[PDB]
Amino acid sequence: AALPNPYDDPFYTTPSNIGTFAKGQVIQSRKVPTDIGNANNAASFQLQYRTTNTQNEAVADVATVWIPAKPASPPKIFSYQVYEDATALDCAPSYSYLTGLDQPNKVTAVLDTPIIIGWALQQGYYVVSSDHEGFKAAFIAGYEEGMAILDGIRALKNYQNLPSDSKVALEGYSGGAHATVWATSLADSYAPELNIVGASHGGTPVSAKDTFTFLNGGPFAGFALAGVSGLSLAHPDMESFIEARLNAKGQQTLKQIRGRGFCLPQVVLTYPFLNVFSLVNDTNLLNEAPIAGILKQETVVQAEASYTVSVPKFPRFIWHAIPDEIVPYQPAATYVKEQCAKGANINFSPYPIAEHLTAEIFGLVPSLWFIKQAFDGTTPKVICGTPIPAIAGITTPSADQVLGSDLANQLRSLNGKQSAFGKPFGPITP
């Protein structure tokens, strides 16, 4: 690619004086060439900034920002979260965004991603996409991800000298939706000064445990293992518990998934029909200390949580395939149900006839339209959590009206094309 592998780059290291930096303070910046940056005539930069990890230690992270040629005013920050879905450093979004084709997780940056970030830049929004997994690549570690994203937004504000009351919106799907919901959940306590006006996420993993039990032993069982890997990297007490119980097969498998170049496509292809419990000497692994307690912390479902879960009050759009075969629908429906009961403002779009990858496209145009409405202060008034399948041209403007001819044609060409997961994308409308 345009830069060396992150493993070979001192930009992806925490400096010794990291404790002198405030949360979201920029340590370093560099100009980078990106596919999206070239396509939209927007300057892209990488920011090394200070953030906080799960163990509450000061650490560095990297985010990619795009500066629109003609910015909207007042300043609007669009925070985009990718479905990285891996536990290796070079799977980082920042590296995948670069011009080049050899990045192992390149696929996460070339399908619907350029359309979304492209659209935001054409609106004049400043765009930030953080490496939400951090330098340890702790996949599905909620506190790690949420804090990294919120500091990433702070980093862009600091870098571009944007006003303290700049409007913020967040968007993501799949693994990116987990990162997004966690950022919105931690915003009140960790980053209350951020003017978050809206959020939009779909195919959302809201419970680490429920996603694990859903995926384990099936064709996408690699993500169950990746989740175990990522949580362990974020929780040292879980790491030690699992390592002591790993058999010979388990020890080599855990090393493999954390190895350089092992990213989303490798996770998909390598571990179909893997039972994660065959890697340890205990089937009751999840119900035991300290794992049971950690899983009660690594959820935004109040019924499962061992803490009081935040209820973001700003307008939100949440979509999901009811028949989702990768990220379970019911935990996400329960989350919406719980949030609405405690006073959330959620536009809920469950699709009765869809899959994980087809709902990714079905909810895209409505997602972006909702975000523009959140920025303009014109989100529709709905009964919280009432099922309204969102359809471009019916419940929102058409793909061409929202995206323009160029980006809508790019979205239409995704129909029948292989995704990161191997499954094909479908049409814009169900």
Query: Alpha-carbon distance 266 to 103, whole Å?
Result: 13
Q: How many CB atoms lie within 10 A of CB 185?
A: 19
Backbone angles phi, psi at 238, to 5 degrees: -75, -40
- Tell the residue number behind the tokens 């099936």, with chain if given: 218
Residues with Cβ within 8 Å of residue 16, at least 6 apart in sequence: none
Q: What is the CA radius of gyration of the chain?
A: 20
Q: Angle CA(274)–CA(181)–CA(87) in degrees, nearest 5?
A: 35
Q: How many CB atoms lie within 10 A of CB 10?
A: 9
1-205+302-430 against 206-301: fold identical: no
Is cis: bond before 236, omega within 30 of 0? no
Encoded tokens for 227: 């989740």
Backbone angles phi, psi at 383, to 5 degrees: -70, 125
First to last CA, the chain: 37
Active-site residue, selected from the candidate residues 131, 166, 356, 419: 356
- The answer to whether 225 and 262 are in contact (CB under 8 A) is no
Query: Alpha-carbon distance 226 to 223, whole Å?
Result: 5
Per DSSP bridges, beta strands 167-173 and 195-202 are parallel
Query: Alpha-carbon distance 381 to 360, whole Å?
Result: 24
Which residues share a beta bridge with 198? 169
Q: Pick the closest to residue 166 from 134, 125, 119 (CA basis).
A: 125
HSE, CB side, 13 Å, CA atoms: give it for residue 377.
3
Experimental technique used to determine this entry? X-ray
- The answer to whether 370 and 189 are in contact (CB under 8 A) is no
- The answer to whether 425 and 360 are in contact (CB under 8 A) is yes
Backbone angles phi, psi at 372, to 5 degrees: -60, -45
- The answer to whether 79 and 391 are in contact (CB under 8 A) is no
Domain layout of the chain by residue ranges? 1-205+302-430, 206-301
Please confirm, yes or no, whether 174 is among the known catalytic residues. yes
What does this entry list as its resolution, in Å? 2.2
For the chain, the residue count is 430
Q: Pick the closest to residue 176 from 135, 146, 136, 211 (CA basis).
A: 146
Active-site residue, selected from the candidate residues 61, 151, 324, 400: 324
Please confirm, yes or no, whether 356 is among the known catalytic residues. yes
Amino acid letter at 49? Y
Active-site residue, selected from the candidate residues 129, 174, 232, 419: 174
Q: What is the 3-state secondary structure (H, E, C) of the chain?
A: CCCCCHHHCHHHCCCCCHHHCCCCCEEEEEEECEHHHHHCCCEEEEEEEEEECCCCCEEEEEEEEEECCCCCCCCEEEEEECCCCCCCHHHCHHHHHECCCCCCCHHHHCCCHHHHHHHHHHCCCEEEEECCCCCCCCCCCHHHHHHHHHHHHHHHHHHCCCCCCCEEEEEEECHHHHHHHHHHHHHHHHCCCCEEEEEEEECCCCEHHHHHHHHCCCCCCHHHHHHHHHHHHHCHHHHHHHHCCECHHHHHHHHHHCCCCCCHHHHHHHCCCCCHHHHECCCCHHHCCCHHHHHHHCECCCCCCCCCCCCCCCEEEEEEECCCCCCCHHHHHHHHHHHHHCCCEEEEEEECCCCHHHHHHHCHHHHHHHHHHHHHCCCCCCCCCCECCCCECCCECCHHHHHCHHHHHHHHCCECCECCCCCEECCCCC
Neighbour-count burial for 268-293, b at 16+ CB within 10 Å, e otherwise: beebeebebeebbeeeebbeeeebee
Q: Pick the closest to residue 368 from 415, 412, 404, 335 (CA basis).
A: 404
- The answer to whether 198 and 315 are in contact (CB under 8 A) is yes
Torsion, CA 334, CA 336, CA 337, CA 339, rounded to 10: 120
Query: Alpha-carbon distance 321 to 423, whole Å?
Result: 14
Q: How many CB atoms lie within 10 A of CB 401?
A: 13
Amino acid letter at 243? E
**What's the CATH fold of domain 206-301?**
434 Repressor (Amino-terminal Domain) (1.10.260)
Query: Alpha-carbon distance 132 to 142, whole Å?
Result: 9
Q: C-alpha 85: how far from its chain's center?
A: 9
Residue 102's region, left for phi above 0, alpha for psi from -120 to 50, else beta, is alpha
Query: Alpha-carbon distance 297 to 304, whole Å?
Result: 9
Sign of CA pseudo-dihedral 43, 48, 50, 54: positive
- The answer to whether 114 and 410 are in contact (CB under 8 A) is yes
The edge-to-edge listing of strands for the beta sheet with 195-202 is 26-32, 43-52, 58-67, 126-130, 76-81, 167-173, 195-202, 315-321, 345-351
CA dist list (Å): 375 to 19, 102, 198, 202, 299: 35, 36, 7, 19, 28
Residues with Cβ within 8 Å of residue 352, at least 6 apart in sequence: 322, 323, 389
Query: Alpha-carbon distance 319 to 188, whole Å?
Result: 23
- The answer to whether 159 and 151 are in contact (CB under 8 A) is no
HSE, CB side, 13 Å, CA atoms: give it for residue 60.
19
- The answer to whether 141 and 125 are in contact (CB under 8 A) is no
- The answer to whether 310 and 189 are in contact (CB under 8 A) is yes
Per DSSP bridges, beta strands 43-52 and 58-67 are antiparallel
Q: Pick the closest to residue 316 from 175, 428, 187, 130 (CA basis).
A: 187
- Tell the residue number behind the tokens 């937004």, with chain if given: 153
Amino acid letter at 428? I
Please confirm, yes or no, whether 398 is among the known catalytic residues. no
User: May I ask the CATH architecture of the domain 1-205+302-430?
Assistant: 3-Layer(aba) Sandwich (3.40)
